[PDB]
Design an enzyme around this catalytic site. Structure first.
Site, PDB file in Angstrom:
ATOM      1  N   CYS A   1      -0.304   9.719  24.633  1.00 15.40           N
ATOM      2  CA  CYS A   1       1.049   9.226  24.882  1.00 15.40           C
ATOM      3  C   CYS A   1       1.033   7.880  25.597  1.00 15.40           C
ATOM      4  O   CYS A   1       1.780   6.976  25.222  1.00 15.40           O
ATOM      5  CB  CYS A   1       1.940  10.253  25.610  1.00 15.40           C
ATOM      6  SG  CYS A   1       1.120  11.377  26.759  1.00 15.40           S
TER       7      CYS A   1
ATOM      8  N   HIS B   1       3.781  13.287  30.369  1.00 15.38           N
ATOM      9  CA  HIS B   1       4.102  12.650  29.099  1.00 15.38           C
ATOM     10  C   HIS B   1       4.600  11.216  29.309  1.00 15.38           C
ATOM     11  O   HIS B   1       5.379  10.942  30.221  1.00 15.38           O
ATOM     12  CB  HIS B   1       5.122  13.498  28.329  1.00 15.38           C
ATOM     13  CG  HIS B   1       5.564  12.887  27.039  1.00 15.38           C
ATOM     14  ND1 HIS B   1       4.676  12.438  26.084  1.00 15.38           N
ATOM     15  CD2 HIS B   1       6.803  12.654  26.542  1.00 15.38           C
ATOM     16  CE1 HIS B   1       5.350  11.947  25.058  1.00 15.38           C
ATOM     17  NE2 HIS B   1       6.642  12.069  25.309  1.00 15.38           N
TER      18      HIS B   1
ATOM     19  N   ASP C   1       0.559  13.777  22.195  1.00 21.80           N
ATOM     20  CA  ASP C   1      -0.760  14.244  21.790  1.00 21.80           C
ATOM     21  C   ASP C   1      -1.870  13.805  22.748  1.00 21.80           C
ATOM     22  O   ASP C   1      -3.033  13.739  22.363  1.00 21.80           O
ATOM     23  CB  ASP C   1      -1.070  13.775  20.361  1.00 21.80           C
ATOM     24  CG  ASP C   1      -1.237  12.255  20.250  1.00 21.80           C
ATOM     25  OD1 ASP C   1      -1.212  11.552  21.289  1.00 21.80           O
ATOM     26  OD2 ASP C   1      -1.402  11.766  19.105  1.00 21.80           O
TER      27      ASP C   1
END
Length: 330
Positions: free
Chosen positions: A99, A225, A96
């Site tokens: 991370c 990410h 989101d």
């Protein structure tokens, strides 16, 4: 069967942590960086999955680890390449745009900063405290990789650290290298990062090493990410450590240590030796049946107390669900 995420095996516990968390932050009047008092010295370690039916050992993994970036970093020979040292495993983390904090928060606590405590601590420390030095090294390093609008672009960064929504992809603002460097200085703990622009070693430079935790936080990075690369509670003998170098076509390019001053980059090995905990490790290399010594940082052995320890829970609940699975998987 087994829960989708480490913390959801005891939410009354999760809460206990997510509440202990902010009470640990010390906010000095001295104008020094907001930092954690004690909870930063905590290190999560995953449980031994190598004890179960291959069919079962497998259902745990779909549950807990992020097999996608696991397979990627390992493929790129950038993650689990050194055989002399323990394997690391990527825990799944909410993508989101917080991370970074989620991955850090997991590595240390079992939980995952859904309360935005870290993200906040970053912003608050970045607004209410002396940016002076950060701004500097940020400039300094932005130059080293340029092959004119300074304070302007930096105002932007402090803005991105904000808890509020982005005026463009997803739910929180994506963080960038400098925030890591700040984060690690709030933690008073190194953070090494394994990737394929951010991969490297970040040190709590705004702190005498004589007073921060000397075991890293290890994160994995892929496709924008962030993930915790946690160590398996293996039996042995493999040393627990991260190589401070990589394997790049037969030579050993060591890691990019970040935001260093120009004098510092000229004495890094000495810095790394003291903010980290360095050991010389023998490594089959050069393919020519020869060996090669590389530097690695000792990794921490799990030390989360009983009171706050989500793994211990998830494991019990795994062992139970395995007795029932073993009794009658037919």
């Amino acid at each position: 069967v087994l829960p989708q995420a480490l913390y959801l095996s005891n939410m009354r516990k999760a809460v206990k942590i997510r509440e202990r968390t902010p009470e640990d932050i010390f906010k000095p009047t001295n104008g020094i960086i907001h930092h954690f008092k004690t909870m930063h010295r905590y290190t999560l370690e995953m449980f031994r999955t190598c004890q179960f039916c291959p069919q079962f050992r497998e259902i745990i993994h779909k549950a807990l680890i992020d097999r996608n970036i696991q397979a990627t970093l390992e493929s790129q020979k950038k993650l689990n390449w050194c055989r002399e040292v323990r394997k690391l495993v990527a825990l799944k983390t909410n993508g989101d745009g917080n991370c970074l904090m989620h991955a850090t928060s997991q590595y240390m606590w079992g939980v995952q900063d859904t309360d935005l405590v870290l993200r906040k601590a970053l912003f608050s420390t970045l607004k209410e405290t002396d940016t002076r030095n950060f701004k500097f090294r940020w400039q300094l390093e932005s130059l080293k990789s340029q092959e004119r609008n300074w304070n302007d672009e930096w105002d932007n960064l402090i803005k991105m650290a904000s808890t509020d929504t982005p005026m463009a992809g997803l739910q929180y603002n994506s963080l960038e290298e400098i925030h890591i460097f700040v984060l690690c200085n709030i933690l008073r703990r190194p953070i090494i990062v394994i990737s394929d622009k951010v991969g490297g070693i970040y040190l709590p430079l705004h702190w005498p090493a004589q007073e921060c935790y000397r075991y890293p936080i290890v994160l994995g990075y892929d496709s924008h990410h962030f993930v915790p690369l946690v160590t398996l509670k293996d039996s042995g003998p493999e040393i627990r450590a991260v190589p401070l170098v990589n394997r790049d076509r037969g030579r050993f390019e060591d890691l990019k240590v970040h935001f260093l001053t120009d004098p510092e980059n000229e004495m890094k090995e000495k810095l790394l030796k003291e903010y980290l905990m360095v050991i010389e490790i023998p490594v089959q290399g050069w393919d020519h049946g020869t060996t090669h010594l590389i530097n690695a940082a000792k990794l921490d052995e799990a030390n989360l107390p009983k009171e706050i320890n989500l793994v211990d829970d998830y494991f019990e609940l795994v062992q139970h669900e395995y007795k029932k699975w073993q009794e009658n998987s037919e």
